[PDB]
Amino acid sequence: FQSNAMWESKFVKEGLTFDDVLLVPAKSDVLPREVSVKTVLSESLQLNIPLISAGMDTVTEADMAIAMARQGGLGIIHKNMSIEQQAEQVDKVKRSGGLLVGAAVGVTADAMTRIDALVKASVDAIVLDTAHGHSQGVIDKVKEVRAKYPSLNIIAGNVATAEATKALIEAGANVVKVGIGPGSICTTRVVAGVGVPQLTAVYDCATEARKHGIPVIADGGIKYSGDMVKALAAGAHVVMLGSMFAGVAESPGETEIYQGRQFKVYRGMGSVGAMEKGSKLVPEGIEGRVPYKGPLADTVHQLVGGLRAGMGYCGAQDLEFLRENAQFIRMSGAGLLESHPHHVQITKEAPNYS
Amino acid sequence: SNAMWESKFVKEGLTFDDVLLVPAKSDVLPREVSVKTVLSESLQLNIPLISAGMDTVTEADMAIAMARQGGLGIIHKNMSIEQQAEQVDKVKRSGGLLVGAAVGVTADAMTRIDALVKASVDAIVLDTAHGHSQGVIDKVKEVRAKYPSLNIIAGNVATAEATKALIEAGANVVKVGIGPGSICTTRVVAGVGVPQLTAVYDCATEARKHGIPVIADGGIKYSGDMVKALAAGAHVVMLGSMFAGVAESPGETEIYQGRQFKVYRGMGSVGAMEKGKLVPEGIEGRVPYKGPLADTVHQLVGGLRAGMGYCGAQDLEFLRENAQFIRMSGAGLLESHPHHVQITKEAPNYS
Amino acid sequence: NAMWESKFVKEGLTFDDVLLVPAKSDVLPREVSVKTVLSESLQLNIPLISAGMDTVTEADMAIAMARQGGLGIIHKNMSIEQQAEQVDKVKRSGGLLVGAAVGVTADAMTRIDALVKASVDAIVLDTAHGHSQGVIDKVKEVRAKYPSLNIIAGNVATAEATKALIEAGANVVKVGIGPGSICTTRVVAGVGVPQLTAVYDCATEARKHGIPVIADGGIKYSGDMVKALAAGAHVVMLGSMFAGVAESPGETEIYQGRQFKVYRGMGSVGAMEKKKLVPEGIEGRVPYKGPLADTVHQLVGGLRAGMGYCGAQDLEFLRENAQFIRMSGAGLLESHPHHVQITKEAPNYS
Amino acid sequence: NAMWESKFVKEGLTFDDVLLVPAKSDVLPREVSVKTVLSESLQLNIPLISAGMDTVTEADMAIAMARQGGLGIIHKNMSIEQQAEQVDKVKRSGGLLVGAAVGVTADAMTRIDALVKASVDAIVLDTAHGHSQGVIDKVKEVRAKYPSLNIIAGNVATAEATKALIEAGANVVKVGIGPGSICTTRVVAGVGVPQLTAVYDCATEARKHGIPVIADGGIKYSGDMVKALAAGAHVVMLGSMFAGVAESPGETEIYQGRQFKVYRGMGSVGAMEKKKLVPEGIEGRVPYKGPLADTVHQLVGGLRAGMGYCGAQDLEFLRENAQFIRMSGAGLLESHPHHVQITKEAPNYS
Ligand SMILES: C=C(C)c1cccc(C(C)(C)NC(=O)Nc2ccc(Cl)c(N[C@@H]3OC[C@@H](O)[C@@H](O)[C@H]3O)c2)c1
Ligand SMILES: C=C(C)c1cccc(C(C)(C)NC(=O)Nc2ccc(Cl)c(N[C@@H]3OC[C@@H](O)[C@@H](O)[C@H]3O)c2)c1
Ligand SMILES: C=C(C)c1cccc(C(C)(C)NC(=O)Nc2ccc(Cl)c(N[C@@H]3OC[C@@H](O)[C@@H](O)[C@H]3O)c2)c1
Ligand SMILES: C=C(C)c1cccc(C(C)(C)NC(=O)Nc2ccc(Cl)c(N[C@@H]3OC[C@@H](O)[C@@H](O)[C@H]3O)c2)c1
Ligand SMILES: O=c1[nH]cnc2c1ncn2[C@@H]1O[C@H](COP(=O)(O)O)[C@@H](O)[C@H]1O
Ligand SMILES: O=c1[nH]cnc2c1ncn2[C@@H]1O[C@H](COP(=O)(O)O)[C@@H](O)[C@H]1O
Ligand SMILES: O=c1[nH]cnc2c1ncn2[C@@H]1O[C@H](COP(=O)(O)O)[C@@H](O)[C@H]1O
Ligand SMILES: O=c1[nH]cnc2c1ncn2[C@@H]1O[C@H](COP(=O)(O)O)[C@@H](O)[C@H]1O
Ligand SMILES: [K+]
Ligand SMILES: [K+]
Ligand SMILES: [K+]
Ligand SMILES: [K+]
């Protein structure tokens, strides 16, 4: 009947994102240079740094995955290519000294065929990427892959609620990817009206996944290295970055001079440009440019450096302590203005602030 | 009694940019969801879109295009009674299409309604600035007593009491929206308004008891705002600025800075009132030319279908009854839009 | 330990935080009564007062304001003789109501005596901090010598300060610490109360004694005046919205083909000159708007629209029954015109 | 589970989130006392300390700050002999008070020995994270060797951190992690506390031991200083507001016809080289302001006006009695001047 308790709970929940909070410094006994940033995603997947490059056609291919793995991270080779081409990218990364590599797979009828070639190429993890992870199609596809490959690392997403996280874990997924709408090139929340603020989404999903011993991945919305520290402190084992990697030298594509500086193309996989590469349509992403940042090593050094400093401020020896003990404090828009530089004209741009 | 003095600053309101829709378990794909909606027995739409009854938005060509897309058009009342009845008759002659017409609360209101009924209009829109007026209530009772089977759309209102008053007067559809229009200054020049998402939610809460649908009119800037309006209790949304740049809109295309634009102004603006001193409650402006209506409608329905898919809603009734929101700050809004990226090209659904 | 734990308890609201809730209405906007009674000998046909500033109100402004049904406050940045002649000029042109600003100094009573001889209708004892012992002692001194004189005291922003001035003998209290468009008090001194909360807090106290309050400062559109009156104020005082009017002092200057007029705070460097100075105001310019009658028509028109939305037959009903709803910053962007390139200016929105 | 469920419970306020509520005042701004006592051997006529940065305070700045009634902290980006000569130069200029900054290294004890022999008045054991064991162990090592030396330890932003440094030997605590105008700690590390909540939380613990705190960073206008003192701080520390005066280190540059001075964070690349460093500061420029005396007069002038609004005859009354009121971003826009095109620059606003 009309006894709709859902009607009066429509506007009950509240959500927080990175710019809403700060990490509260605590007693510390460990220097930043001696903290442990290693993380374990499964029994056959350990990362020395908690950084994964996104599986997008302007972010990660073979050269990016090789450079990411040599930094201690992981690269997800995108799926906007043929099955044999993607397997050739995976095989190229594997032969380069026994490095880790991942590959993205869509939820289509041809998914099992693509996963077969990736497993034959000795892929370490597949990423069942989709816009709405909490669908029956993704759930059924996780179970079919789990039955065929019991020892394969499966990364499933994207989700933003605890119930969605529970459904993917009991379907076979050993890693859950969190993020509906936070991406720098994403318009899902604008054209569809759906999303969860990324920090609340990471906290709600990690709350459910910690009951089963499953890690979660913070995917999208990270603009500065401090946002990565907040995502890990909110419960995530590892973060996935797109915009902060699209400008590095190992990224696909060359440099074009724009506004007098070198720029690189960065576009969403749900944009018009990306969807036509693998084919009106209602897009959920945009196309654009990010500044050129030189080699990947210089960017990863700044990222890890900011994490080590933040863990020093919080007294975290390893990521598990930060995940379980770090406390936040909420601030208003005025607090954000105070957090950034203010009332001073910046002359030289810093390696970690633009 | 100091009850009214102590409750002045108690209520709180939310707009579209304050909230997001929470994803839920989904068994349906966006292309297999149903966007149909029923306002009454004699007024069913294939898509939940109504074009605003404004002189720069909807005339005969716009109403014909809206109906052939599955929606509805409201012929504006800034014309003679014979001209509005003739435009209604043109739309009906184009294949029995659904069409509406706007009527004010004046002395010639019944005369204009008499001519619109003879033209076989499908719905009368008694539109006024303050729907919670005694004159508006009396007019609805005067029309309902004369035409017991006529679809009467009354507005605009923004509170639960006003919704109950118009329903008890005879209105079978209620229009919600005081202030949120893109060309509206009512909240600025008069200080009166209710945040549109809270207004829709409060009016639908009262209207759902009596089985009366509400129209979310004004404030919609992207296709995601329409999803939030329907999820908040609205059966159908009304759009103005989203339809002004469409080729089927009345008025020719102007050239400004080489680009193509179309005039868009509020019915309470100075220019609109001089057509048919003054204290205006709207402004006059221009919007970019968007081309044929079919391209704009495709993007709007596509975002709605994607939104219903995220929420696991097969039909619009499930969205109204089950969709949950989450509140966010301004920082959440900035995260929701694209950010820290130099946009290269404009998207079809993101301007 | 109670004062230490209550430092951050209070919350405050301003005009852009709220909207008025429409209500059942049986009255058309052209039927409403905008009259207001400040005292037995001070009745206004419109709830509008022009601020006592040297770029807003002099003889010509006060004459035009009073003819529209309002009131003008002649500023005090002039000699006693010159201010007495300004007041007499307004009285000699039809017997119009007029007010005059007076500061708290040793010269205060001498200036008040000349204004009273000029048949001034209301003295505005305007100071930066109305909640001081010097201002209170001055109000008792003036009321003792002039029992029938209308005394407007300010500025204050708390219920405690409102009660102190009423018990001192003031019959009208002026509210506003910081919200002025040219004011920097909250920036340079860190002190203030959000104007809508200040009006409501002071009106809550003043209504117990049957004393009206003036909402002074922060009004940038006609809708802000409606909110201030609905929050408990009997009348509003405007500065920036009258500084561009032709009847204001100063000439019109043209900048990039558009006319402007000078507008500055009385605590700015320029006003007090007319290194050792620490100002609490800035100096700037506002667009030229032409005759006062056009601005007043838009102002009263916007008020009549708002009173119609609220079902207020008179200002006393709106003062006691109007309800607000709070909104965020996204609600403010929705309230203003948005996502449309504005082609031409409106007479009440620029 | 308790630590997991309390992650997002606390809420923090900054300067632009609140205003000071005006109260009854029997005291004029010119007759209030702005003196403060940090310890028995460190008393200041005005509550101003210039930051220990290579673009803010050296010998000339500390001399001018001391002659104005404040204190200057010699930065540590120089050899031990250079810093001792700078401290000695300030002492030779009429027995003026001077402070010196010291880092937490193995060289710290040797640097402190040379500063003590130069008759330094207070050392500033400054570091990025004052709530670490190395900073605690260093304070205890310095306190044991110099029981009468004024030790200012920081930086911190938590009551627990304040207690740890107090029990280690520090008689003055410096509050501030993030709010600096040139600081990017909160951006690149994600760590910080809104400055006004940090000052209030740390002063809450410090006052239970009779220990003063220093509000360090985030002050953009004179009103922010009044809020920091009213939040519980005995004295404020300024960097950006002092870097543009003549007495600060560096020389004047020209940019777009105006005069500027270089101002950079000590955690910036330029300050540390004086691509392996991960900086927590930026390099920039600030407009030239002239002699220090003109800036100090506007700062103290804002404090005297704010204390007059609050009815605080001394700084102790302001810390113990001043009440705040919270406001939204709309209230912040009302606080600043608005809807008026500013024509002239005020000596205390932009
Ligand atoms: C004012 C700032 C912020 C600043 C100034 C100059 C330079 C810095 C740099 C950029 C170097 N960043 C920094 O040192 N970050 C930091 C972060 C977290 C922690 Cl826990 C620590 N912990 C230890 O504290 C004790 C002492 O040994 C310190 O040297 C350090 O090793 C340090 C920053
Ligand atoms: C990263 C994003 C957002 C993105 C990337 C590339 C492309 C897209 C596009 C723009 C194509 N939009 C999208 O797919 N929208 C969407 C919306 C709502 C729902 Cl419920 C679904 N549901 C189904 O999920 C399971 C699987 O069947 C999927 O194929 C899908 O049909 C999809 C978006
Ligand atoms: C805001 C919109 C959409 C708008 C559109 C065109 C024009 C207007 C104008 C600018 C004319 N302003 C308006 O009419 N203001 C208004 C304010 C308050 C009240 Cl109470 C009323 N009451 C109505 O008076 C007339 C009659 O319809 C009565 O029945 C009653 O409803 C009207 C505004
Ligand atoms: C409208 C403003 C703000 C303004 C207008 C013109 C000039 C001013 C100036 C810039 C001069 N600042 C000012 O006076 N600041 C102020 C601050 C705090 C207090 Cl407590 C007081 N107390 C007053 O001392 C003198 C005496 O009148 C006392 O009775 C009492 O009123 C004054 C400001
Ligand atoms: O076009 C798209 N629409 C919505 N989300 C996208 C799209 N393309 C990439 N994403 C997401 O955004 C993430 C990277 O965004 P960023 O790191 O914040 O710039 C990816 O890992 C995806 O999860
Ligand atoms: O001038 C006016 N004043 C106030 N509201 C108006 C005016 N003109 C149109 N509207 C409203 O605004 C709606 C369209 O606004 P939009 O869809 O946001 O651009 C219309 O359907 C009316 O409800
Ligand atoms: O310089 C000043 N400092 C602080 N407040 C002022 C100053 N000058 C005028 N005001 C106040 O600001 C009001 C007008 O401001 P406005 O109408 O909002 O622009 C006046 O009536 C005074 O109450
Ligand atoms: O580079 C740095 N990183 C972080 N904080 C800094 C740095 N340099 C100075 N600070 C802090 O910022 C204060 C001055 O900043 P300001 O007065 O707000 O502009 C100093 O007293 C230090 O506490
Ligand atoms: K900062
Ligand atoms: K986004
Ligand atoms: K509007
Ligand atoms: K102001």
Structure description:
Four copies of one chain form a homotetramer. By secondary structure, chain A is of the alpha/beta class. Chain A has one domain (18-339): Alpha-Beta Barrel (TIM Barrel). Chain A is 35% helix and 19% strand. An eight-stranded parallel β-barrel of chain A has the order 5-6-7-8-9-10-11-12, surrounded by seven helices. In chain A, a hairpin with a 2-residue loop joins strand 13 (256-258) and strand 14. In chain A, helix 3 (83-95) runs parallel beside helix 4 (111-120) and helix 6 (162-169) crosses helix 8 (198-209). The longest helix of chain A is centred in the C-terminal third of the chain and has 19 residues, at 296-314. The radius of gyration of chain A is 20 Å and the shape is globular. Chains in contact: A-B, A-D, B-C, C-D. Chains A and B meet through strand 1, helix 6, helix 7, strand 14 and strand 15 of A and strand 2, helix 8, helix 9, helix 12 and strand 16 of B. Bound molecules: the ligand C=C(C)c1cccc(C(C)(C)NC(=O)Nc2ccc(Cl)c(N[C@@H]3OC[C@@H](O)[C@@H](O)[C@H]3O)c2)c1 (4 copies), inosinic acid (IMP) (4 copies) and potassium ion (4 copies). One copy of the ligand C=C(C)c1cccc(C(C)(C)NC(=O)Nc2ccc(Cl)c(N[C@@H]3OC[C@@H](O)[C@@H](O)[C@H]3O)c2)c1 sits between chains A (107, 130-132, 135, 137-138, 188, 269-270, 283-284) and B (26, 29-30, 306, 309-310).
Put the structure in a nutshell.
The structure is a homotetramer. With 354 residues, chain A is of the alpha/beta class.
